[PDB]
Amino acid sequence: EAPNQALLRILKETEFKKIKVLGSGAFGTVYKGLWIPEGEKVKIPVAIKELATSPKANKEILDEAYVMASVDNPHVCRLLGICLTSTVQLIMQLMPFGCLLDYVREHKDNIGSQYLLNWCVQIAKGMNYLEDRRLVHRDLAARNVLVKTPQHVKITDFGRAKVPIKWMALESILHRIYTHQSDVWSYGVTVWELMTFGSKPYDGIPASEISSILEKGERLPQPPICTIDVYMIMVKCWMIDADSRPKFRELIIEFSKMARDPQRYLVIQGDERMHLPSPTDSNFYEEDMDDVVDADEYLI
Ligand SMILES: Cc1nc2cnc(Nc3ccnc(NCC(C)(C)C(N)=O)n3)cc2n1C(C)C
Known part of the structure; x- marks a missing residue:
């Protein structure tokens, strides 16, 4: 190639x-x-x-x-x-705001539907790019999504890119088969982590029980803020048949449609009135702040 x-x-x-x-x-x-x-x-x-x-x-x-x-x-x-x-x-x-997992846990009270849905769009975009570059992540989780600004998140940790059982597709646990469609399963779990404001998936359940639990038909529960519309997407990422799961390009589309009217797809008490830091904030950006440029603007 x-x-x-x-x-x-x-x-x-x-x-x-x-x-x-x-x-x-x-x-x-x-x-x-x-x-x-x-x-x-x-x-x-x-x-x-x-x-x-x-x-x-x-x-x-x-x-x-x-x-x-x-x-x-x-x-x-x-x-x-x-x-x-x-x-x-x-x-x-x-990425000054650290990982998305710790971010959702620490800021749940100021995180609204627009933010959650936009993060979903962004993760799907980065994942669709990794697919275009024929790269299977093998470790997608909210811990491996970093926050540059509350409105801009990026996928990281390529140590497995070519074991996190509770984020893995059934084929990966049972047969060590990893595809872009197995990354879609991990995507569904990542979305669940965000929608629950950082809950531990299958909390208290030992990793050795997961394989049997998924084989029976058990999946992660519907988060309280989730409408059937959003949960249906999450469920589709967790189908036995990998080809039946959505493609990342469809996930961009699905979440983008929803991000245009976030309150119709996520029910959060206090929504819209909530606000997180922005480059339009006072002292948003220790020594000399004179000639500092972000890496995204530094291109040789
Ligand atoms: C609290 C905190 N503040 C950060 C600022 N910037 C980065 N920058 C980056 C950029 C790319 N990749 C990584 N590594 C993430 C690792 C490998 C530590 C991971 N598994 O989450 N860090 C990471 C930061 N963190 C933790 C995730 C260690």
Whole structure:
């Protein structure tokens, strides 16, 4: 097939600074940072992901670097570059509001129908782009959707892009079969996570029981804010037959139609009166805020 002419940018350790720690987990440790390239007179807010140095861990991070440098879409997280230290670190775009999962949990009282439906449209767009680029995500979840601004979200975590059982299609659990249609199942679960304001899917149920539960016909419940219209979509993503599930291009269409009249498709008490931060807010954007540009506007 087509040759991957993507550019792997090698960045000098001296070109960027680590400010603080954003989070630590299974992935490793992510730092808030700033990138001041050569003599460009720009400051790019960055996120620095770093891994003991072992040949296997370096291979896995470089396998993720490959995939992340090969994407370019407004609703997908691109790799800005890599730094070849003893540790070896990925330089990514700063998504100041963190993951969508923690965002919906922390801001449920100010999250309205317009926001939820727009996020659904955005995730479907990024997913449809990954399909166009013939990339199967294999780990789509609300935890792997990051927030640039409350009105702009992007898909991340390409560590599995080529086990999260409670987000997996039945074929994936039973036969380790992963398709773009299996990503659609994970999409349905991600939507459920948003519509419930960050609830844990199949909470208290052990992962070993999931396979049997889905085989019987059991699915995630209808969230209280969901009309049958939205839940029907979620259910369609969870069909046994992968071809019967909606395509991401249809999900963009479906959620966009709904996003044009959000109160007809999501019932939230206090809707419209709710408001989240915007670039039209006072002090929305620590040291020198003079020459700072977002990575989406920094293009060499
Ligand atoms: C609290 C917080 N603030 C952030 C600001 N910016 C990023 N930037 C990016 C950009 C692309 N990819 C990632 N990595 C997400 C990981 C791999 C940590 C994941 N599995 O969620 N972070 C990540 C941030 N977080 C956590 C998800 C670690």
